[PDB]
Amino acid sequence: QKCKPTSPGRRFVEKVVHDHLHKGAPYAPLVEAKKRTGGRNNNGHITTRHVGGGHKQHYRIVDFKRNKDGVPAVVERIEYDPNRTAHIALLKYADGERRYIIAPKGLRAGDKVQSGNDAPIRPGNCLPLRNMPIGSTLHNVELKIGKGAQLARSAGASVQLLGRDGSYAIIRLRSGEMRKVHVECRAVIGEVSNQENNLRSLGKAGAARWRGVRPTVRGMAMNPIDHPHGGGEGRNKGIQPVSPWGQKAKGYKTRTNKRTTKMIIRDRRVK
RNA sequence: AUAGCACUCUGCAAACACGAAAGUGGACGUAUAGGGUGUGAUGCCUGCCCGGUGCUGGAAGGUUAAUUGAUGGGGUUAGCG
């Protein structure tokens, strides 16, 4: 959707339109308060730069574990969620309990979902990787038994199931990494909704300020006391790029963990 | 500074940051996400060079630390003179 250039700040605005989303208030029992941080920790110092401001938001309690095995549920509606890029679906169980889940692509009001070993192979059903059919597209992949989904949760995300060896399943992630998972962990059929999410163009600086991003100052624009890039008469770089704390920014690898290196077989390539 | 563009790092107990540690932010987020760097709507575009410094990947050839202690040479005295 294009906006007409009636003002200079509207010339380059792109929006994604979805007419099936619910327009009313969210489901009250599943909503709680959430505060802004400003990127400051309990010492009160800034630990993440460029964070502050933005619109007030409530947190929606999303069920990532899907431990209500055996009971079918029906989708009531699809909702916008300010905490994430994907849409959410309100579920209605056969015994009156209501929960939120991440909405798979194509799920509409009136569809049926469930979880467990005996669930059918339909988008939105939650089954163990040992029971998943080989070659399927999955999302919401769990890493620790019972902890819940952690991988491939954003809009348009999906992973590919490739094979099953020993007690481990082989998956390919959307970053290009190829990895092992325990076969007992769960996953969900399908790929995540709102796949047009990356087509939007903000159009102006205020749009970023609404989402809570403060401006970025280049290190080249500072003094020597503030940044290794600071200083000089006129414009000049004269240095191999580094972070404000001296760490190289172009190609230098930073992974350190040695505990989980066995679970990665084929790295995405240029890690 | 900016919307837009590009490179690069990060598979989640994430990279990164604060702190002596416990711990906290990143985020009650999960590669369409998060950090760093440069450029700066849009239109047409963005040539040659990897010798130097850096980064990434190999090699098991040469050099090299703590550790180990084979050999060789001294000091001393039983005794022989």
From Swiss-Prot:
Residue ranges, annotated region (Disordered): 35-54, 221-253
Keyword field contains RNA-binding: yes
Ranges of compositional bias, category Basic and acidic residues: 226-236
Top-rank taxon, per record: Bacteria
UniProt KW keywords: Ribonucleoprotein, Ribosomal protein, RNA-binding, rRNA-binding
Record GO biological process: cytoplasmic translation
GO molecular function, one term: transferase activity
GO cellular component entries: large ribosomal subunit
Protein family (similarity comment): Belongs to the universal ribosomal protein uL2 family.
Subunit structure: Part of the 50S ribosomal subunit. Forms a bridge to the 30S subunit in the 70S ribosome.
Function as written in the Swiss-Prot or TrEMBL entry: One of the primary rRNA binding proteins. Required for association of the 30S and 50S subunits to form the 70S ribosome, for tRNA binding and peptide bond formation. It has been suggested to have peptidyltransferase activity; this is somewhat controversial. Makes several contacts with the 16S rRNA in the 70S ribosome.
HAMAP family named in the record: Ribosomal_uL2_B (MF_01320_B)
Protein name: Large ribosomal subunit protein uL2
Naturally occurring in which organism (per UniProt): Acinetobacter baumannii (strain AB0057)
Gene that encodes it: rplB
